């Protein structure tokens, strides 16, 4: 079941933006969202993507845990963040693409193409660069969709070991406080119009998980931090998190 709350839309227009914000009782089994038609509108993924590309990395052998050190390559980028050593947790932390662009040349067209398959993501369409097609390639993703997907790796129900989604639910740790736990990744789009921002993740309770996936539109990058701050009046509205 699926019910539009029009009232979230002030959350989107107060903040002088427009957007989606979709939720997923787990206990219920029951979805909201501001706007059903652009909850189901498929967008890049962009750097959500580092979530499905880490556990394919993982499960492949191409990194072998969360503490192997990827070199920086001495190339000096505009992302000061991008200019050093990471390893898994910190690259994605800091959405470090030059790092994943080398885990999706290891991992090739074939094997990436068949774990997203096998994964339901999406539209499961890797066409472009093997390492920047969820930037400006043929892939793409709703909000909806988003959830589905996080719903079966919160589960263990990917077809990738437990311990590969074991260690990215782990690298997706943003936020823990004696009232919840929020395990995510942001997206940022630029590179094909629509420019927009992205949140998926998950809100973990003592008693309950609330899944979420938002996107937004992004004509500057001064409008990021709207990413996180609109989710949570909706989720305080809510009463997810005080
Ligand atoms: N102007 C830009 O092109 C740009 C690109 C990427 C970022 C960035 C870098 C690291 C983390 C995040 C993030 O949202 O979590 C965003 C910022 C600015």
Same mark, same amino acid.
């Given at each position: 079941?699926?019910?539009?709350?029009?009232?979230?839309?002030?959350?989107?227009?107060?903040?002088?933006?427009?957007?989606?914000?979709?939720?997923?009782?787990?206990?219920?089994?029951?979805?909201?969202?501001?706007?059903?038609?652009?909850?189901?509108?498929?967008?890049?993924?962009?750097?959500?993507?580092?979530?499905?590309?880490?556990?394919?990395?993982?499960?492949?052998?191409?990194?072998?845990?969360?503490?192997?050190?990827?070199?920086?390559?001495?190339?000096?980028?505009?992302?000061?963040?991008?200019?050093?050593?990471?390893?898994?947790?910190?690259?994605?932390?800091?959405?470090?693409?030059?790092?994943?662009?080398?885990?999706?040349?290891?991992?090739?067209?074939?094997?990436?193409?068949?774990?997203?398959?096998?994964? =339901?993501?999406?539209?499961?369409?890797?066409?472009? &660069?093997? #390492?920047?097609?969820?930037? !400006? @390639?043929?892939?793409?993703?709703? /909000?909806?969709?988003?959830?589905?997907?996080?719903?079966?790796?919160?589960?263990?129900?990917?077809?990738?070991?437990?311990?590969?989604?074991?260690?990215?639910?782990?690298?997706?740790?943003?936020?823990?406080?004696?009232?919840?736990?929020?395990?995510?990744?942001?997206?940022?789009?630029?590179?094909?119009?629509?420019?927009?921002?992205?949140?998926?993740?998950?809100?973990?309770? =003592?008693?309950?998980?609330?899944?979420?996936?938002? &996107?937004? #539109?992004?004509?500057?990058? !001064? @409008?990021?931090?709207?990413?996180? /701050?609109?989710?949570?009046?909706?989720?305080?509205?809510?009463?997810?998190?005080?």
């Amino acid at each position: 079941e699926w019910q539009e709350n029009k009232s979230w839309n002030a959350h989107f227009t107060e903040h002088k933006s427009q957007g989606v914000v979709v939720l997923w009782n787990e206990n219920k089994q029951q979805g909201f969202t501001n706007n059903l038609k652009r909850a189901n509108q498929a967008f890049l993924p962009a750097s959500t993507f580092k979530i499905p590309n880490s556990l394919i990395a993982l499960d492949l052998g191409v990194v072998k845990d969360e503490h192997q050190v990827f070199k920086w390559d001495g190339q000096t980028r505009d992302i000061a963040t991008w200019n050093r050593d990471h390893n898994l947790i910190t690259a994605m932390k800091y959405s470090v693409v030059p790092v994943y662009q080398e885990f999706a040349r290891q991992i090739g067209e074939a094997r990436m193409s068949k774990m997203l398959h096998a994964f =339901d993501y999406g539209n499961e369409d890797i066409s472009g &660069n093997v #390492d920047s097609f969820w930037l !400006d @390639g043929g892939i793409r993703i709703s /909000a909806t969709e988003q959830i589905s997907f996080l719903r079966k790796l919160y589960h263990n129900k990917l077809h990738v070991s437990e311990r590969s989604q074991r260690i990215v639910k782990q690298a997706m740790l943003t936020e823990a406080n004696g009232d919840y736990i929020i395990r995510a990744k942001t997206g940022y789009s630029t590179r094909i119009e629509p420019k927009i921002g992205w949140w998926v993740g998950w809100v973990e309770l =003592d008693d309950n998980v609330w899944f979420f996936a938002m &996107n937004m #539109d992004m004509p500057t990058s !001064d @409008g990021l931090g709207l990413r996180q /701050a609109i989710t949570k009046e909706v989720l305080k509205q809510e009463k997810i998190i005080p």
